[PDB]
């Protein structure tokens, strides 16, 4: 009866929506995770308190994304099959005596809203990106900013007290500042907001103290309510643990605050040359490091670079990232600065080396370095290349610089406020409780 519909196969949208769903189950609601038939056949289910249900994206037996690597093509296929099968699911669930009370959906599936509203099901948008990025996309949707969005447009928003930092060219969201590079992602980013005013509720995985001006503006403009960081309650010190993963055993043997965790997420791909610069930078830093290089990227790693990494590092295809970040051995996180990774670092008080690619990452990386003060951003050379020397410099700058304590201080400060927000009486907890009562 509360249906949860993340963008399919995006763990960064899945995890936080499941964590919201767990808190709703605490309040006595009944959550169901809605995923594709493919993901359902090929992934273990979430377990209690969740039911699971399926829709189709056109590809029930193979990965549709794999088959349809042009983003606009995959997204029109998902819309056509998904909208049909979501409507069928709303009816089958009602016929099975489990009518949906509300659909909480990722607005990167904007067809979900129309499908649900036409079945008479309430709708709640769930934004898994930061308010600062979200509100820029909403301004374009509302026809208050043209494309492309410029630094001058961002400076206006700063001047008006809506953004808390002045975004330059390398900081504005590329999907709207350089829309020709990613047409389908531009349109998807802006369409999140088309019809959002028709929703019963709008939720965002952030907390007001982290993004005060932006959260306030999202609330006044879009009715968006902060409900994050939407993470396991253990990490938030909310009293209302420890795996057997082999990389964790490695981490246990390293000294306190010694290790660099390295990940560029599950989406972006790095060519052989970029992997070479990244891995050599890690080895040249002299620090112990845990390098996540996905199974689907690891063919790009040479024998000699892997051997070089054996001295002080460990390369894995996946790690339990929250458990790593919480570990006493972890000193910093060299991250692409996707929002889930950034929130996970904040909740654990871990300083950041930001290596953004696209989406929300450039904007987050500017916040990290220039407002929040919790790390540094790598500087690309004149031709856009990340050099091993710069990877190394940034690692050493956060772990050893004159400013080491500045990044730590800010990470810790933010950590405390993130926990406050989710604990009883906190700004995000209040919004969760409001929602749970509404739908009880
Ligand atoms: O090796 C791992 C292990 C866990 N995750 C988890 O998967 C989610 C999505 O991560 P990603 O970095 O792609 O998200 P983003 O930071 O870009 O939003 C986050 O909850 C991560 O903690 C991961 O991404 N890589």
The secondary structure of 297-361 as a DSSP string is TGGGS-HHHHHHHTTTEEEES---HHHHHTSTTEEEEEE---HHHHHHHHHTT--EEE---STTH
- The secondary structure of residue 385, as a DSSP letter, is P
Beta carbon of 230 within 6 Å of any ligand 1 atom: no
Q: List phi, psi (to 5°) of 125.
A: -75, 140
Pairwise CA distance, residues 325 & 69, whole Å: 32
Element (H, E) at 31: strand 31-36
C-alpha distances (whole Å) from 230 to each of 22, 153, 251 are 10, 31, 25
CA dihedral 143, 145, 147, 148 (to 10 degrees): -170
Q: Which of 57, 81, 106, 201 is catalytic?
A: 106
CA proximity to 366, closest of 217, 215, 181, 158: 158
The yes-or-no answer on residue 381 being catalytic is: no
Cis amide linkage into residue 229, ω under 30° from 0: yes
Buried b (16+ CB within 10 A) or exposed e, 208-226: bbbbebbbebbbebbebbb
CATH 3.40.50.2000-classified regions of the chain: 1-239+421-440, 240-420
Longest dimension (CA), the chain: 65
Hey, which residues does 105 pair with through a beta bridge? 5, 125
Nearest ligand 1 atom to the CA of 319 is: 1
Beta carbon of 226 within 6 Å of any ligand 1 atom: no
Pairwise CA distance, residues 307 & 244, whole Å: 25
Beta carbon of 12 within 6 Å of any ligand 1 atom: yes
Task: Using alpha carbons only, give the angle 56, 34, 97 rounded to the nearest 5 degrees.
Answer: 105
Q: Which single residue is written with the structure tokens 């189950």?
A: 25
CA dihedral 430, 432, 437, 438 (to 10 degrees): 110
- The secondary structure of residue 155, as a DSSP letter, is H
Beta carbon of 11 within 6 Å of any ligand 1 atom: yes
CATH of domain 1-239+421-440: 3.40.50.2000
**Resolution given for this structure, in angstroms:** 1.6
Smallest CA separation from ligand 1 atom 5, residue: 321
Residue pair 114/90 in contact (Cβ under 8 Å)? The answer is no
Pairwise CA distance, residues 291 & 375, whole Å: 19
Total residues found in the chain within this entry: 440
Residue pair 255/329 in contact (Cβ under 8 Å)? The answer is yes
Residue pair 296/400 in contact (Cβ under 8 Å)? The answer is no
Pairwise CA distance, residues 35 & 8, whole Å: 6
Q: CB under 8 Å to 355, separation ≥6 — which residues?
A: 264, 278, 334, 335, 336, 337, 365, 377, 378, 386, 391
Number of Cβ within 10 Å of residue 66's Cβ equals: 10
Residue pair 294/362 in contact (Cβ under 8 Å)? The answer is no
Which fold would CATH assign to domain 240-420? Rossmann fold (3.40.50)
- The secondary structure of residue 149, as a DSSP letter, is P
**Cα-only R_g, the chain:** 21
């Amino acid at each position: 009866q509360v249906l949860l519909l993340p963008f399919p196969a995006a763990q960064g949208h899945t995890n936080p929506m499941l964590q919201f769903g767990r808190r709703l189950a605490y309040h006595g609601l009944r959550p169901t995770l809605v995923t594709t038939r493919y993901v359902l056949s090929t992934t273990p289910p979430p377990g209690d308190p969740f039911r699971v249900a399926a829709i189709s994206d056109g590809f029930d037996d193979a990965s549709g994304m794999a088959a349809l690597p042009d983003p606009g093509e995959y997204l029109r296929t998902l819309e056509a099959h998904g909208a049909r099968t979501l409507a069928e699911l709303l009816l089958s669930e009602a016929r099975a005596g489990r009518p949906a009370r509300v659909l909480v959906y990722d607005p990167h599936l904007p067809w979900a809203r129309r499908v649900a509203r036409a079945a008479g099901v309430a709708t709640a948008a769930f934004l898994s990106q930061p308010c600062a990025v979200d509100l820029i996309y909403g301004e374009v949707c509302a026809r208050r900013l043209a494309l492309p969005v410029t630094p001058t447009d961002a400076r206006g928003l700063y001047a008006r007290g809506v953004l808390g930092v002045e975004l330059g060219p390398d900081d504005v969201p590329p999907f709207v500042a350089a829309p020709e590079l990613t047409p389908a992602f531009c349109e998807q980013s802006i369409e999140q907001f088309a019809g959002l005013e028709d929703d019963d509720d709008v939720l965002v995985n952030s907390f007001s103290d982290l993004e005060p001006k932006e959260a306030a503006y999202m609330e006044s403009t879009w009715r968006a309510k902060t409900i994050g960081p939407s993470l396991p309650s253990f990490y938030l010190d909310d009293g209302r643990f420890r795996s057997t993963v082999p990389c964790m055993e490695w981490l246990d043997k390293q000294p306190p605050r010694s290790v660099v965790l390295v990940s560029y997420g599950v989406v972006s791909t790095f060519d052989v040359a970029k992997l070479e610069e990244l891995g050599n930078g890690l080895c040249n830093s002299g620090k112990p490091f845990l390098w996540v290089v996905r199974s689907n990227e690891e063919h790009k790693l040479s024998v000699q670079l892997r051997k070089k990494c054996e001295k002080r590092g460990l390369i894995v295809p996946f790690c339990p990232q929250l458990e790593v970040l919480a570990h006493k051995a972890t000193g910093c996180f060299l991250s692409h600065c996707g929002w889930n990774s950034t929130l996970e670092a904040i909740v654990n008080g871990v300083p950041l080396v930001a290596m953004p690619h696209w989406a929300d990452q450039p904007t987050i990386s500017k916040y990290v370095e220039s407002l929040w003060g919790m790390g540094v951003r790598v500087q690309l050379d004149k031709s856009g290349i990340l050099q091993r020397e710069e990877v190394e410099r940034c690692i050493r700058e956060v772990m050893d610089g004159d400013r080491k304590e500045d990044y730590r201080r800010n990470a810790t400060r933010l950590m405390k406020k993130a926990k406050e927000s989710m604990q009883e009486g906190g700004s995000s907890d209040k919004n969760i409780a409001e929602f749970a009562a509404k739908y009880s």
